[PDB]
């Protein structure tokens, strides 16, 4: 350093960096590049500093100073190909990168195909672009996007006819309705079986008859849902409630029926519904004049502790005994297990059943090294170096007893 | 036939799985084995690949896997060691990254596909909600994957289609300060000029209302938090709609699980007794006396709704006054009486006992008992049921946790593993 | 005065414009939904047809206004002022931009329907073409496009390109690079400007050398970078590749620049180009481009103007300047004082 200081020169600086690269020293190379005041190479170095392998950093420096074959040799020596794959993609030989990824990686092959397809699209060879898009992971959206970017629709018609895929039909029909091609969009939607699209198109022109026929013959959940949405503004509350029930949207139908005050529909649909709607409907019936139906729904509901409480409140006898037996059962399943008792019981029962291989991490966490070694000897568990230095910390023992226990465990492992 | 040798077939099987495209099975096999260094490295590589290939859903899933791995590392001890805190904040940050990735995936799926001139009202409402939530959550972090321009453009378009004049103006100013391709420029100045003459003060009935406050809030309020106080919002991930949820904490002395039994016994004893009951006293006080006041302003609206006279709400108001006095956030700590006045169904506690046996637990209460909420504990995600059954019927896999549905039988057999 | 063509049943006349001045309006402009009024006092006003209100006002507007020409959409407008001055006005930004190298007797300006950036000004005998550039680094560029035959030897201001028009003929409008020239006997000639004329004359089937280079030069003049990259890929010269890559990077055309640099055979720039392609943050990209291409102080200024001055601090630490880096670190983020200090200890 003190000899270099007296002269300084950019050619001298790059020569110094070359010697540093060939001698396998990095920090002095970083100092030389800093003296170069080459911001691009320094940015590349700072980006590449997050690598445990110094060979990759040296190859980065070499490719920064334009030593390509030395960088290739360093990549081969480091058993690293993904960085070499990126370099080979960047320089231009795509087929060589494809072969290297196929025979070594098999991970970035789809990315290589996508990048080659993008390069082909830049080259404007659309046939190669669509071919490599098919070879790539995704082709449903890349092809139509690039094909409208070119603006040539007719070969896109050819492609959608050849492929015959539902997403392609949906996208093409959306484009048709964008340019107000209503009839062909309807035909392509029919080919795509998106019945919500036909329903919304028919309700755009208020043609409720055809939409009703279509929803009656298809019987789709979302189509009935949106048709009931329209019926809400159409003043068709009973048919809307029926369609909402058919669409498995229980909450809206039950709340609407409660708001408008109908009786048989609400429990008829709550019997087939989840627990929450059952509880809400039973509470609503408790608000209603006849609380007997509320009591019955609570009896058939998912909550029985409250059912027992209200059975005592109403001081009946037969249903009191029925709910008493049910509460005895519920107390039994609740006594089956608790949550902290769950932790302790899973630990102990897990030890009891066996599976020592997943028991070993628990003992590592609990520091019961002697029990872990006893279990390993008991079930012939292989003791690898990771287990050895997990049981025995690499830090020096602070206490004499700590070192004695460490030595005892180490000789037991031996 | 030989239960004593397991790994000897798994490791060659793990290598073979790595050979094929079933990388997630290789990840789970490596996690079961224990060697996760190269597993985490290759998972980070896959996350980078998924982000580059615009597969933001797979990127969010990979970031969730990374966060779960960091939490499994958090399992190490429970004493107040700085590694625990740094790993916990890393886990929170990775969860935020996963959510912002999912939101950007949704908005990108919207923007990439050509927009319908006459689209569904619910669809565009959902798109607007997703864009607003993503903008609020991200704000200025400019993390890896988000260009920050698609969100603003989509929000502006959907606001122009749904009034939202103030939000439209704010996002249009942001996009003007932003750089846009020349295709959308003349359109953006034309839209700004047209909207300049439209009436201001938004359109009401769309702004979220923060719980425990009953105060209106603007759509864009920094990092997803109401301006009135310091309280985190909750949104269903399918619909991106604000949830009526509040957060409360439990005492460290009382154990929650004997507490469940005691509180249930409290509800049972408080009904046939002649000493009345606090739970029904609250309902009767709400029914008898009712105060409902509304005040209009430019951006905000103050909703004075305190009709429901319950001990929980009284203590909540007192704590809110304390927060105003201190101007700092202190989470509410509750005693046995208040929860004794509570019930079983409304609690929606989130548990992480699967990944770590004893790390933390969060407790949430729903103000509106009529709306049903389902909490997926595999991913700890809240959903409104009404679309949750439809989503489960459409596909037997939960969107975020990416695991099998509860209705179907165990599919993760030896073949799947 | 205003009028409605379709209805005659309505008996309510349109709200009369103008103010107590009640003088002849110097400039009137109809757009799809806006009306532009320019009065003799030197004030410009915008009027919404539906609301009948003055949305935009500008009183100062230099010394005095004479003539006006608005865009078909209204987002752009050009103003001709006394002593033959010219200005460009944007209602969105509410700020003027002076115009340079304009003739003092040109009477009309024709916008381009194909590209809002390009427009033309018609002198009594000559036609000039102007473009508006907003993607230029740290600059909103307006410049009369030149004509040049040198082989990338000089990049300096020169004579503007002029299209010779016949006597007593008036082109109706300019669109798609085609001008609707009108000549007697009712003849409409599309013709072409002598900037796009060589663009349309080029075929490139068998390709040439001098004509190909002229085509590349005119594409670079008109920023048709796809034609530029194809013209580059025909001729494998490395210096042209480097020049095209630098020019594309200068106009934040990142894909063309990366393709040119990849074809050249250089990678150290392409990794940085991809890293810049990831980021969308705007002052960040502009400062990164300034740093990657040329000077460093302007990149530092852009980074301070952004919301990440720590990027400028680390860039200055890269430059290894004691005074600038240390003073900036103390100014913005004094919590990183130790590490940089250690560096200078090595120094
Ligand atoms: Zn609040
Ligand atoms: Zn889930």
């Amino acid at each position: 350093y003190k000899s270099v200081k007296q002269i300084q020169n950019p050619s001298i600086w790059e020569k110094m960096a070359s010697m540093c690269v060939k001698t396998k020293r990095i920090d002095v190379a970083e100092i030389c590049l800093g003296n170069m005041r080459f911001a691009r190479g320094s940015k590349a170095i700072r980006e590449q500093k997050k690598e445990p392998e110094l060979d990759a950093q040296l190859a980065m420096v070499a490719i920064q100073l334009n030593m390509k074959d030395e960088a290739v040799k360093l990549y081969e020596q480091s058993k690293r190909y993904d960085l070499y794959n990126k370099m080979l993609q960047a320089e231009g030989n795509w087929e060589k990168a494809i072969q290297i990824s196929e025979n070594h990686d098999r991970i970035n092959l789809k990315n290589t195909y996508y990048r080659t397809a993008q390069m082909y699209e830049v080259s404007n060879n659309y046939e190669q672009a669509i071919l490599y898009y098919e070879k790539s992971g995704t082709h449903v959206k890349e092809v139509p996007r690039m094909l409208l970017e070119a603006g040539q629709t007719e070969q896109l018609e050819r492609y959608i006819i050849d492929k015959n895929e539902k997403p392609l039909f949906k996208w093409w029909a959306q484009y048709l309705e964008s340019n107000y091609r209503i009839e062909l969009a309807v035909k392509f939607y029919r080919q795509s079986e998106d019945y919500d699209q036909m329903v919304r198109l028919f309700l755009t022109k208020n043609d409720v008859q055809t939409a009703s026929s279509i929803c009656s013959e298809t019987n789709n959940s979302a189509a009935c849902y949106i048709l009931a949405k329209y019926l809400e503004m159409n003043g068709q509350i009973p048919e809307a409630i029926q369609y909402y029930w058919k669409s498995q949207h229980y909450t809206q139908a039950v709340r609407l029926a409660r708001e408008k005050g109908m009786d048989n529909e609400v429990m008829s649909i709550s019997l087939q519904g989840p627990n929450q709607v059952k509880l809400q409907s039973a509470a609503y019936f408790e608000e209603k004049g006849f609380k007997q139906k509320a009591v019955e729904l609570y009896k058939k509901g998912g909550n029985l502790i409250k059912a027992y409480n209200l059975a005592q409140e109403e001081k009946l006898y037969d249903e009191a005994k029925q709910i008493a037996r049910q509460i005895e059962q519920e107390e039994d399943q609740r006594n089956k297990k608790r949550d902290p008792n769950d932790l302790a019981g899973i630990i102990d029962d897990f030890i009891e059943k066996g599976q020592p291989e997943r028991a070993v991490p628990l003992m590592i966490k609990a520091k019961q090294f002697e029990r872990a070694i006893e279990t390993c000897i008991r079930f012939n568990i292989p003791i690898t170096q990771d287990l050895v230095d997990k049981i025995i910390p690499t830090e020096p023992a602070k206490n004499a007893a700590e070192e004695n226990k460490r030595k005892e465990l180490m000789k037991l492992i031996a | 036939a030989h239960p004593e040798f397991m790994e000897i077939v798994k490791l060659p099987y793990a290598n073979w799985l790595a050979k094929q495209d079933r990388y997630e099975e290789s990840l789970k096999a490596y996690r079961k084995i224990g060697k996760h260094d190269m597993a985490t490295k290759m998972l980070y590589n896959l996350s980078q690949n998924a982000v580059f290939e615009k597969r933001f859903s797979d990127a969010a899933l990979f970031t969730w896997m990374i966060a779960t791995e960091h939490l499994g590392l958090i399992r190490n001890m429970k004493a107040p060691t700085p590694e625990d805190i740094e790993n916990l904040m890393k886990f929170y940050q990775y969860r935020d990254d996963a959510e912002i990735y999912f939101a950007y995936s949704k908005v990108q799926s919207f923007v990439d596909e050509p927009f319908l001139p006459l689209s569904g009202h619910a669809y565009m409402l959902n798109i607007f909600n997703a864009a607003r939530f993503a903008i609020n959550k991200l704000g200025n972090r400019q993390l890896y994957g988000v260009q920050h321009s698609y969100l603003y453009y989509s929000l502006g378009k959907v606001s122009k289609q749904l009034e939202g004049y103030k939000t439209a103006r704010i996002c249009y100013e942001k996009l003007a300060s932003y750089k846009i391709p020349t295709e959308w420029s003349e359109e953006i100045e034309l839209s700004t000029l047209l909207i300049r003459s439209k009436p201001y003060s938004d359109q009401e009935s769309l702004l979220p209302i923060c719980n425990r406050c009953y105060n209106q809030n603007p759509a864009l309020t920094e990092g997803n938090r109401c301006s009135s106080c310091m309280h985190q919002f909750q949104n269903c991930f399918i619909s991106f709609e604000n949830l009526p949820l509040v957060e409360f904490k439990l005492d460290p002395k009382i154990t929650h699980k004997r507490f469940i039994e005691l509180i249930n016994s409290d509800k049972s004893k408080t009904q046939p007794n002649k000493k009345k009951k606090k739970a029904n006293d609250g309902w009767q006080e709400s029914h008898q006396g009712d105060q409902q006041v509304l005040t209009f302003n430019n951006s905000p609206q103050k909703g004075g709704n305190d009709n429901e006279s319950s001990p929980f709400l009284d203590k909540l108001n007192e704590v809110f006054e304390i927060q105003q006095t201190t101007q700092e956030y202190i989470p509410v700590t509750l005693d046995e009486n208040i929860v004794s006045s509570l019930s079983i169904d409304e609690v929606y506690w989130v548990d992480y006992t699967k990944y770590c046996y004893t790390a933390e637990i969060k407790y949430y209460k729903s103000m509106l008992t009529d709306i049903p909420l389902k909490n997926c504990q595999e991913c700890g995600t809240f959903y409104i049921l009404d679309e949750y059954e439809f989503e489960i019927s459409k596909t037997q896999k939960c969107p975020f946790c990416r695991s099998v549905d509860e209705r179907a039988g165990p599919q993760k057999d030896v073949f799947d593993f | 005065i205003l009028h409605t063509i379709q209805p005659n049943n309505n008996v309510k006349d349109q709200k009369f414009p103008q103010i107590e001045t009640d003088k002849a309006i110097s400039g009137i402009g109809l757009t799809n939904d806006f009306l532009i009024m320019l009065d003799s006092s030197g004030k410009i006003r915008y009027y919404h047809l539906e609301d009948q209100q003055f949305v935009v006002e500008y009183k100062p507007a230099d010394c005095q206004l004479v003539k006006i020409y608005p865009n078909f959409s209204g987002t752009r407008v050009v103003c001709f002022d006394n002593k033959g001055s010219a200005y460009l006005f944007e209602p969105a930004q509410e700020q003027f931009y002076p115009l340079e190298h304009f003739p003092q007797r040109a009477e009309k300006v024709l916008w381009d329907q194909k590209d809002p950036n390009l427009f033309a000004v018609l002198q009594n005998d000559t036609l000039i073409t102007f473009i508006i550039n907003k993607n230029n680094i740290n600059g909103t560029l307006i410049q009369p496009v030149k004509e040049l035959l040198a082989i990338e030897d000089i990049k300096n201001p020169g004579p503007p390109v002029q299209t010779i028009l016949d006597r007593g003929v008036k082109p109706l409008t300019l669109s798609n690079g085609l001008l609707k020239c009108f000549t007697p006997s009712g003849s409409i000639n599309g013709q072409n400007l002598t900037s796009h004329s060589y663009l349309g004359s080029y075929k490139g089937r068998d390709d040439t050398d001098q004509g190909h280079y002229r085509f590349f030069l005119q594409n670079l003049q008109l920023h048709k970078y796809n034609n530029c990259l194809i013209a580059a890929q025909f001729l494998h010269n490395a210096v042209l590749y480097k020049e095209l890559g630098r020019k594309a990077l200068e106009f934040v055309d990142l894909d063309v620049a990366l393709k040119s640099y990849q074809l050249a055979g250089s990678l150290s720039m392409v990794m940085t180009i991809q890293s810049f392609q990831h980021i969308n943050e705007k002052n960040i990209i502009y400062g990164n481009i300034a740093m990657i291409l040329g000077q460093y102080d302007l990149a530092q200024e852009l980074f301070l103007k952004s919301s990440q001055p720590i990027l400028a601090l680390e860039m200055r630490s890269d430059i290894q300047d004691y005074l600038t880096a240390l003073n900036l670190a103390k100014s913005i983020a004094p919590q990183e004082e130790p590490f940089i200090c250690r560096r200078l200890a090595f120094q």
Side-chain angles (χ1 to χ4, degrees), chain B residues 209-217 225-233 320:
Chain B
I209 296 170
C210 69
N211 292 113
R212 93 194 283 270
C213 298
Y214 285 5
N215 291 320
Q216 204 65 257
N217 296 119
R225 197 94 57 177
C226 70
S227 66
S228 291
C229 76
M230 187 66 203
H231 165 66
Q232 171 64 245
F233 281 96
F320 156 72

Side-chain angles (χ1 to χ4, degrees), chain A residues 34 37 42-43 46 64 90, chain C residues 262 267-268 314 318-320:
Chain A
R37 253 83 171 178
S42 65
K43 181 72 84 191
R46 282 185 291 103
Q64 192 55 72
Chain C
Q262 172 271 348
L267 292 80
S268 62
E314 62 84 17
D318 186 6
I319 306 301
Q320 289 166 349

Side-chain angles (χ1 to χ4, degrees), chain C residues 197-212:
Chain C
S197 61
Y198 209 78
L199 190 146
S201 73
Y202 180 71
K203 51 175 67 65
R205 307 278 79 78
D206 61 346
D207 186 74
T208 52
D209 189 72
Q210 180 55 255
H212 194 52

Side-chain angles (χ1 to χ4, degrees), chain C residues 292-312:
Chain C
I292 195 68
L293 200 55
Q295 69 280 357
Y296 307 131
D297 175 49
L298 188 153
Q300 170 263 336
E301 202 274 320
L302 284 176
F303 285 160
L304 276 296
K305 193 180 287 185
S306 64
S307 67
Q308 289 83 17
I310 189 66
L311 196 67

